[PDB]
Amino acid sequence: YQTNRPEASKRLFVSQEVERQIDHIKQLLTNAKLAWMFENCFPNTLDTTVHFDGKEDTFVYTGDIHAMWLRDSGAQVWPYVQLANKDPELKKMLAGVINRQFKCINIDPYANAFNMNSEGGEWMSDLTDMKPELHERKWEIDSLCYPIRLAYHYWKTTGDASVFSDEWLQAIANVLKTFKEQQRKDDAKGPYRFQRKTERALDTMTNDGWGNPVKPVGLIASAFRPSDDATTFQFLVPSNFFAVTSLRKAAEILNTVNRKPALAKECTALADEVEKALKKYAVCNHPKYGKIYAFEVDGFGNQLLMDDANVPSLIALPYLGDVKVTDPIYQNTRKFVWSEDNPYFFKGSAGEGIGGPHIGYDMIWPMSIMMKAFTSQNDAEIKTCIKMLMDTDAGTGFMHESFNKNDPKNFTRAWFAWQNTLFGELILKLVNEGKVDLLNSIQ
Amino acid sequence: YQTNRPEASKRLFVSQEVERQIDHIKQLLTNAKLAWMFENCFPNTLDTTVHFDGKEDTFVYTGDIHAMWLRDSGAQVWPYVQLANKDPELKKMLAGVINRQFKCINIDPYANAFNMNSEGGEWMSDLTDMKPELHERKWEIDSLCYPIRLAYHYWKTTGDASVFSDEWLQAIANVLKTFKEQQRKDDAKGPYRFQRKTERALDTMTNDGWGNPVKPVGLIASAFRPSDDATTFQFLVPSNFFAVTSLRKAAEILNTVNRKPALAKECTALADEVEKALKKYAVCNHPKYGKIYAFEVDGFGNQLLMDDANVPSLIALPYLGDVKVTDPIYQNTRKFVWSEDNPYFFKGSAGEGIGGPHIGYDMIWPMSIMMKAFTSQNDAEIKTCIKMLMDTDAGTGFMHESFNKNDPKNFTRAWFAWQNTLFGELILKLVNEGKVDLLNSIQ
């Protein structure tokens, strides 16, 4: 069993603390394959996607796609924050990620993906206001939430508030302006419009680029989902939940750090409005599972019952910390999403899980399985999830975007940094929780 | 007030009975504008779209779009059937339409539009199995229902069953095969797949061309709506209702005419299954309007609450005769669709009505207003509808596809034969019902 990591000399970024961490788990885990996968995945982001300038800037690619997603980057380095206090170089690189994310938001708060400079790209021709610094401009609420989540954890972990300077002040102001604009209270259309000539229905918006209408009930419209697919009803519930928590984190930062009570109150006020609207528009009395959370709503009364593997998702609500795992409505939702009553839940001879319209029928995303484990309150459940991830890797030793429910050999995206980071994060979390014996019991 | 009809010498098809009909209403109506519009609209199909070979074939164009829609053609000549018993040439032309429709269905029961021969067209490159005889291959349930509706009315009206020969036998068999295939009980995918590289989200299907998943509860999946837009949840309720009635009509034909009890029973059995599934999947307990009919459902539990102007529609249910106008659930639905709770109901300074995602926000389709009048049980309501159609024609004296809720001058499709036929049909129906005094009361 030889590692699939590039090579000491080919690795883009090296973190000694990270290296010490995998050494520990390797000698701690008794399953050769599991340890092998952890060594390949956990450091993947550092090994092949991190571009640190040694100063205050860090550019992070997603892997397969040569660009930087605010979402992917915010998650790709997330599990490293807990090691920053023991690695000065790592800590500086993390601050560089945050600094770059905030600069991206200020370039275009509606964009989901950015280029290192201004090389533009194939999507420059999209029917929307483009800029050479952008790789893609699909409006996704979670794009603005992930950076805040990272910066907050970073700050609380290291105590370093140097990342909350002028750039941050402008970015947070742009997040509020964009969130408010997308509540679409004044006009059903607005500043953001998007269409693209493609054969993929969810890569373009309906109604001349304005998307399906929404009734301004206080929720924030999201043109696209964290899966990069267009929403059916724009008030994406999982992303709105993520927005509430992110706004509250920013408010705490603006208060204790920048000491700007006015701007913080705006964050809090918006969070309260979105949270109240969620409580009366995002809940559905399902006849089989009881009260559950809808995936998307339009404010007119329509509610889409389903779930997509991409985080933020309904099942991942507790992972991001938007709801307690004990939330009764969440538990009911958890049962629903992992059943044949969810149009995107698939089950075959290779395993089961949630997929989405992005790849299509029978294609399950391991991300959904990992989130099931991350939010699990039962060791037996966690064990089956880990083993399933192990048996559906097609011997590549990496995490893929999706695989066929009847044949893992049929999979997409062999190099998905965000997914590998999540797997390393899961195993590390389990270990730090004293569940090593559980992992070591894997056949 | 000079007529907008082409010219006696430029008219494609001439019907003396039709000419006598407009002469009667002209001297009967006291409103110059109304009479003018009736003379322009009622005969529009005959004046500019009918191509009769003098034998057993009739090709009918839609007008703006140079092709034949099974849907449009079946409606464009509908109101003429009641005059066939007094016009031999007209009667033969109607039989030629039916004959051509059945031949189309046998060419490709999944296609919605056909060419006169095999000139192909711009959609030949669509990501689906194309044929030069086809103009477009968007699967729309109503495409197979409209021809049956016409043939049945024709037969019951004239007594001529010569249209139910070998071609009809093959076509009806194709309708059953196609309907059954689209219940998608054996596989969530099937023989029909469709995608197109376009910027219009509803001109392509999600999930690699298979559309959004459906749970095989007995309903028939419809890839696209009578508006030519892709469905969100494939079990289109209005079209499934239309399917039930059409199947029952065909069963009666197969029994009394072709005397084939076996094939007829298959039609009846399918109708019963679809009807039962409608009763338990297409109904929604709306908290504001009570029990109403959903627009589309997926069988998993999702229900789309809205309405589109294109017939078959929810409001037009009684018009096509799929439900009694007295149906309580229909009445509740009628209130809902004509309110701000319907995402596609628009109201402005020019008037109000239903539109759809096809053209976009604020664009109301007069078809919705006409259907409101057609299904109305109140003279006052009918009067406002007629006057609204009169005040939103932009002085063109014709029926348009849609107009801006705040400015009728902003409209689409100046030449829409199907719509003109419907307006002439509405006025004629009102007159034959002794409501001339009502029309003559229009200011």
mmCIF file with all atom_site columns, N, CA, C and O in Angstrom, chain B residues 323-348:
data_model
loop_
_atom_site.group_PDB
_atom_site.id
_atom_site.type_symbol
_atom_site.label_atom_id
_atom_site.label_alt_id
_atom_site.label_comp_id
_atom_site.label_asym_id
_atom_site.label_entity_id
_atom_site.label_seq_id
_atom_site.pdbx_PDB_ins_code
_atom_site.Cartn_x
_atom_site.Cartn_y
_atom_site.Cartn_z
_atom_site.occupancy
_atom_site.B_iso_or_equiv
_atom_site.pdbx_formal_charge
_atom_site.auth_seq_id
_atom_site.auth_comp_id
_atom_site.auth_asym_id
_atom_site.auth_atom_id
_atom_site.pdbx_PDB_model_num
ATOM 1   N N  . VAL B 1 323 ? -64.080 18.292 -16.419 1.00 0.00 ? 323 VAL B N  1
ATOM 2   C CA . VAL B 1 323 ? -64.753 18.370 -15.120 1.00 0.00 ? 323 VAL B CA 1
ATOM 3   C C  . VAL B 1 323 ? -65.970 19.262 -15.322 1.00 0.00 ? 323 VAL B C  1
ATOM 4   O O  . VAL B 1 323 ? -66.012 20.047 -16.267 1.00 0.00 ? 323 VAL B O  1
ATOM 5   N N  . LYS B 1 324 ? -66.961 19.131 -14.446 1.00 0.00 ? 324 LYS B N  1
ATOM 6   C CA . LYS B 1 324 ? -68.158 19.957 -14.521 1.00 0.00 ? 324 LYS B CA 1
ATOM 7   C C  . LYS B 1 324 ? -67.772 21.323 -13.974 1.00 0.00 ? 324 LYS B C  1
ATOM 8   O O  . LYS B 1 324 ? -66.933 21.416 -13.081 1.00 0.00 ? 324 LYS B O  1
ATOM 9   N N  . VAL B 1 325 ? -68.378 22.384 -14.494 1.00 0.00 ? 325 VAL B N  1
ATOM 10  C CA . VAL B 1 325 ? -68.080 23.726 -14.001 1.00 0.00 ? 325 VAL B CA 1
ATOM 11  C C  . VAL B 1 325 ? -68.521 23.835 -12.542 1.00 0.00 ? 325 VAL B C  1
ATOM 12  O O  . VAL B 1 325 ? -68.051 24.697 -11.812 1.00 0.00 ? 325 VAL B O  1
ATOM 13  N N  . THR B 1 326 ? -69.435 22.958 -12.139 1.00 0.00 ? 326 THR B N  1
ATOM 14  C CA . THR B 1 326 ? -69.968 22.945 -10.784 1.00 0.00 ? 326 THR B CA 1
ATOM 15  C C  . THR B 1 326 ? -69.066 22.213 -9.790  1.00 0.00 ? 326 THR B C  1
ATOM 16  O O  . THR B 1 326 ? -69.289 22.281 -8.578  1.00 0.00 ? 326 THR B O  1
ATOM 17  N N  . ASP B 1 327 ? -68.068 21.498 -10.306 1.00 0.00 ? 327 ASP B N  1
ATOM 18  C CA . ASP B 1 327 ? -67.119 20.769 -9.465  1.00 0.00 ? 327 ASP B CA 1
ATOM 19  C C  . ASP B 1 327 ? -66.612 21.762 -8.414  1.00 0.00 ? 327 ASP B C  1
ATOM 20  O O  . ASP B 1 327 ? -66.017 22.789 -8.757  1.00 0.00 ? 327 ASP B O  1
ATOM 21  N N  . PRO B 1 328 ? -66.857 21.478 -7.125  1.00 0.00 ? 328 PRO B N  1
ATOM 22  C CA . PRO B 1 328 ? -66.428 22.351 -6.026  1.00 0.00 ? 328 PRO B CA 1
ATOM 23  C C  . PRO B 1 328 ? -64.914 22.561 -5.965  1.00 0.00 ? 328 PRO B C  1
ATOM 24  O O  . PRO B 1 328 ? -64.455 23.660 -5.699  1.00 0.00 ? 328 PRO B O  1
ATOM 25  N N  . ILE B 1 329 ? -64.142 21.510 -6.216  1.00 0.00 ? 329 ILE B N  1
ATOM 26  C CA . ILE B 1 329 ? -62.690 21.634 -6.197  1.00 0.00 ? 329 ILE B CA 1
ATOM 27  C C  . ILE B 1 329 ? -62.237 22.541 -7.339  1.00 0.00 ? 329 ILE B C  1
ATOM 28  O O  . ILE B 1 329 ? -61.272 23.290 -7.193  1.00 0.00 ? 329 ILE B O  1
ATOM 29  N N  . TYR B 1 330 ? -62.932 22.481 -8.473  1.00 0.00 ? 330 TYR B N  1
ATOM 30  C CA . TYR B 1 330 ? -62.593 23.322 -9.616  1.00 0.00 ? 330 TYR B CA 1
ATOM 31  C C  . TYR B 1 330 ? -62.876 24.787 -9.287  1.00 0.00 ? 330 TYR B C  1
ATOM 32  O O  . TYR B 1 330 ? -62.078 25.671 -9.614  1.00 0.00 ? 330 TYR B O  1
ATOM 33  N N  . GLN B 1 331 ? -64.021 25.044 -8.654  1.00 0.00 ? 331 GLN B N  1
ATOM 34  C CA . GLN B 1 331 ? -64.396 26.407 -8.287  1.00 0.00 ? 331 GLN B CA 1
ATOM 35  C C  . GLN B 1 331 ? -63.367 27.005 -7.345  1.00 0.00 ? 331 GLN B C  1
ATOM 36  O O  . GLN B 1 331 ? -62.992 28.168 -7.496  1.00 0.00 ? 331 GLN B O  1
ATOM 37  N N  . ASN B 1 332 ? -62.911 26.222 -6.367  1.00 0.00 ? 332 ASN B N  1
ATOM 38  C CA . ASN B 1 332 ? -61.899 26.723 -5.431  1.00 0.00 ? 332 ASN B CA 1
ATOM 39  C C  . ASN B 1 332 ? -60.634 27.035 -6.223  1.00 0.00 ? 332 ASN B C  1
ATOM 40  O O  . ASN B 1 332 ? -59.998 28.065 -6.001  1.00 0.00 ? 332 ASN B O  1
ATOM 41  N N  . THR B 1 333 ? -60.278 26.140 -7.144  1.00 0.00 ? 333 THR B N  1
ATOM 42  C CA . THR B 1 333 ? -59.086 26.319 -7.977  1.00 0.00 ? 333 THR B CA 1
ATOM 43  C C  . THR B 1 333 ? -59.205 27.575 -8.837  1.00 0.00 ? 333 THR B C  1
ATOM 44  O O  . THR B 1 333 ? -58.231 28.296 -9.038  1.00 0.00 ? 333 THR B O  1
ATOM 45  N N  . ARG B 1 334 ? -60.411 27.821 -9.342  1.00 0.00 ? 334 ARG B N  1
ATOM 46  C CA . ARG B 1 334 ? -60.680 28.982 -10.184 1.00 0.00 ? 334 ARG B CA 1
ATOM 47  C C  . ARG B 1 334 ? -60.380 30.275 -9.431  1.00 0.00 ? 334 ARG B C  1
ATOM 48  O O  . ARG B 1 334 ? -59.862 31.229 -10.005 1.00 0.00 ? 334 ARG B O  1
ATOM 49  N N  . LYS B 1 335 ? -60.713 30.317 -8.146  1.00 0.00 ? 335 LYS B N  1
ATOM 50  C CA . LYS B 1 335 ? -60.447 31.516 -7.359  1.00 0.00 ? 335 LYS B CA 1
ATOM 51  C C  . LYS B 1 335 ? -58.949 31.699 -7.143  1.00 0.00 ? 335 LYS B C  1
ATOM 52  O O  . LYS B 1 335 ? -58.414 32.798 -7.295  1.00 0.00 ? 335 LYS B O  1
ATOM 53  N N  . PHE B 1 336 ? -58.283 30.604 -6.804  1.00 0.00 ? 336 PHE B N  1
ATOM 54  C CA . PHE B 1 336 ? -56.851 30.603 -6.565  1.00 0.00 ? 336 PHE B CA 1
ATOM 55  C C  . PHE B 1 336 ? -56.041 31.029 -7.779  1.00 0.00 ? 336 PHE B C  1
ATOM 56  O O  . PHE B 1 336 ? -55.142 31.868 -7.671  1.00 0.00 ? 336 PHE B O  1
ATOM 57  N N  . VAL B 1 337 ? -56.344 30.457 -8.939  1.00 0.00 ? 337 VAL B N  1
ATOM 58  C CA . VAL B 1 337 ? -55.556 30.787 -10.121 1.00 0.00 ? 337 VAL B CA 1
ATOM 59  C C  . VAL B 1 337 ? -55.697 32.237 -10.553 1.00 0.00 ? 337 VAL B C  1
ATOM 60  O O  . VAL B 1 337 ? -54.775 32.819 -11.130 1.00 0.00 ? 337 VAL B O  1
ATOM 61  N N  . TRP B 1 338 ? -56.843 32.833 -10.247 1.00 0.00 ? 338 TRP B N  1
ATOM 62  C CA . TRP B 1 338 ? -57.084 34.220 -10.620 1.00 0.00 ? 338 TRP B CA 1
ATOM 63  C C  . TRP B 1 338 ? -56.857 35.119 -9.406  1.00 0.00 ? 338 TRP B C  1
ATOM 64  O O  . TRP B 1 338 ? -57.701 35.943 -9.065  1.00 0.00 ? 338 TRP B O  1
ATOM 65  N N  . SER B 1 339 ? -55.717 34.947 -8.744  1.00 0.00 ? 339 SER B N  1
ATOM 66  C CA . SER B 1 339 ? -55.388 35.760 -7.574  1.00 0.00 ? 339 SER B CA 1
ATOM 67  C C  . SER B 1 339 ? -53.880 35.960 -7.492  1.00 0.00 ? 339 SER B C  1
ATOM 68  O O  . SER B 1 339 ? -53.117 35.318 -8.220  1.00 0.00 ? 339 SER B O  1
ATOM 69  N N  . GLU B 1 340 ? -53.462 36.845 -6.590  1.00 0.00 ? 340 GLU B N  1
ATOM 70  C CA . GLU B 1 340 ? -52.048 37.158 -6.379  1.00 0.00 ? 340 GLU B CA 1
ATOM 71  C C  . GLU B 1 340 ? -51.314 35.989 -5.737  1.00 0.00 ? 340 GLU B C  1
ATOM 72  O O  . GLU B 1 340 ? -50.110 36.053 -5.530  1.00 0.00 ? 340 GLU B O  1
ATOM 73  N N  . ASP B 1 341 ? -52.045 34.930 -5.412  1.00 0.00 ? 341 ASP B N  1
ATOM 74  C CA . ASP B 1 341 ? -51.421 33.771 -4.805  1.00 0.00 ? 341 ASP B CA 1
ATOM 75  C C  . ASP B 1 341 ? -50.878 32.828 -5.874  1.00 0.00 ? 341 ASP B C  1
ATOM 76  O O  . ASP B 1 341 ? -50.186 31.862 -5.567  1.00 0.00 ? 341 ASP B O  1
ATOM 77  N N  . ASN B 1 342 ? -51.203 33.122 -7.131  1.00 0.00 ? 342 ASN B N  1
ATOM 78  C CA . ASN B 1 342 ? -50.719 32.341 -8.266  1.00 0.00 ? 342 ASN B CA 1
ATOM 79  C C  . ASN B 1 342 ? -49.501 33.111 -8.746  1.00 0.00 ? 342 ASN B C  1
ATOM 80  O O  . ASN B 1 342 ? -49.601 34.281 -9.125  1.00 0.00 ? 342 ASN B O  1
ATOM 81  N N  . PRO B 1 343 ? -48.325 32.474 -8.711  1.00 0.00 ? 343 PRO B N  1
ATOM 82  C CA . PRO B 1 343 ? -47.101 33.149 -9.153  1.00 0.00 ? 343 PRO B CA 1
ATOM 83  C C  . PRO B 1 343 ? -47.146 33.704 -10.576 1.00 0.00 ? 343 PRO B C  1
ATOM 84  O O  . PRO B 1 343 ? -46.357 34.591 -10.919 1.00 0.00 ? 343 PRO B O  1
ATOM 85  N N  . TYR B 1 344 ? -48.074 33.213 -11.400 1.00 0.00 ? 344 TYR B N  1
ATOM 86  C CA . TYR B 1 344 ? -48.167 33.717 -12.766 1.00 0.00 ? 344 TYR B CA 1
ATOM 87  C C  . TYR B 1 344 ? -49.422 34.511 -13.112 1.00 0.00 ? 344 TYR B C  1
ATOM 88  O O  . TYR B 1 344 ? -49.768 34.665 -14.284 1.00 0.00 ? 344 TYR B O  1
ATOM 89  N N  . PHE B 1 345 ? -50.088 35.026 -12.083 1.00 0.00 ? 345 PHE B N  1
ATOM 90  C CA . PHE B 1 345 ? -51.259 35.873 -12.270 1.00 0.00 ? 345 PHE B CA 1
ATOM 91  C C  . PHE B 1 345 ? -50.732 37.302 -12.187 1.00 0.00 ? 345 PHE B C  1
ATOM 92  O O  . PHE B 1 345 ? -50.089 37.666 -11.203 1.00 0.00 ? 345 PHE B O  1
ATOM 93  N N  . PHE B 1 346 ? -51.001 38.110 -13.209 1.00 0.00 ? 346 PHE B N  1
ATOM 94  C CA . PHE B 1 346 ? -50.531 39.492 -13.222 1.00 0.00 ? 346 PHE B CA 1
ATOM 95  C C  . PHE B 1 346 ? -51.693 40.474 -13.328 1.00 0.00 ? 346 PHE B C  1
ATOM 96  O O  . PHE B 1 346 ? -52.714 40.174 -13.947 1.00 0.00 ? 346 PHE B O  1
ATOM 97  N N  . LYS B 1 347 ? -51.516 41.651 -12.726 1.00 0.00 ? 347 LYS B N  1
ATOM 98  C CA . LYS B 1 347 ? -52.529 42.706 -12.743 1.00 0.00 ? 347 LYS B CA 1
ATOM 99  C C  . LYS B 1 347 ? -51.896 44.082 -12.893 1.00 0.00 ? 347 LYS B C  1
ATOM 100 O O  . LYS B 1 347 ? -50.997 44.432 -12.143 1.00 0.00 ? 347 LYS B O  1
ATOM 101 N N  . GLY B 1 348 ? -52.380 44.866 -13.849 1.00 0.00 ? 348 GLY B N  1
ATOM 102 C CA . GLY B 1 348 ? -51.829 46.194 -14.062 1.00 0.00 ? 348 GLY B CA 1
ATOM 103 C C  . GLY B 1 348 ? -52.892 47.193 -14.477 1.00 0.00 ? 348 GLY B C  1
ATOM 104 O O  . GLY B 1 348 ? -54.079 46.955 -14.268 1.00 0.00 ? 348 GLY B O  1
#
